[PDB]
Write a protein that binds this ligand. Structure first.
Ligand SMILES: Cc1cccc([C@@H](CC(=O)O)NC(=O)c2ncnc3[nH]ccc23)c1
Length: 167
């Protein structure tokens, strides 16, 4: 039993809810919140910009030190950093950005990072400003993640389409 409430169950291990991942994180305080990161951990917009703003820029400060030490992530890769006031940890995961020409096949690799964590609160990878089809992102999620994932979809119209079209 966990504290996530109001989700629609899609599969044994994948759940979905129309919610702002920021407000969901502040309420649940999950062990892991997933950020839709880029390779530079520049949290300027989208989910990343929203999560970072909610940390009063502490996420960005921590991320800049991480990059200065370690260099950029790989597309499809991840790193674990602090969750600040939102969660114990933040798993920064880089899905391919279609508006940069990156191989959509890397979306499966991106979701594989979730399997290193028993429970996660997460967005749909490569959706929104990353340019991929969110219906496709959801399919890859369900077919790749085996741990328990609670998906927050900010757009209500997108949420209803994802549910109604799910096979
Ligand atoms: C990868 C990527 C980039 C850009 C945009 C999105 C969309 C996709 C959608 O609508 O779910 N989601 C969000 O931006 C989002 N999701 C949950 N909680 C949130 N809080 C504030 C914003 C926000 C996704």
């Amino acid at each position: 039993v966990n504290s996530f409430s109001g989700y629609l169950k899609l599969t044994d291990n994948v759940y979905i809810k129309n919610a702002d991942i920021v407000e969901e994180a502040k309420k649940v305080k999950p062990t892991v919140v997933v950020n839709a990161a880029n390779v530079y951990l520049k949290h300027g917009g989208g989910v990343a910009g929203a999560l970072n703003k909610a940390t009063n820029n502490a996420m960005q400060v921590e991320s800049d030190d991480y990059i200065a030490t370690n260099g950029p992530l790989k597309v499809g890769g991840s790193c674990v950093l602090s969750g600040h006031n939102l969660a114990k940890h933040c798993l920064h995961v880089v899905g391919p950005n279609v508006n940069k020409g990156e191989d959509i096949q890397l979306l499966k690799s991106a979701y594989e990072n979730f399997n290193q964590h028993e429970v996660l609160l997460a967005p749909l990878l490569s959706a929104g400003i990353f340019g991929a089809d969110p219906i496709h992102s959801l399919r890859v999620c369900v077919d790749t993640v085996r741990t328990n994932v609670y998906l927050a979809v900010f757009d209500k119209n997108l949420y209803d389409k994802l549910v109604s079209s799910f096979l």
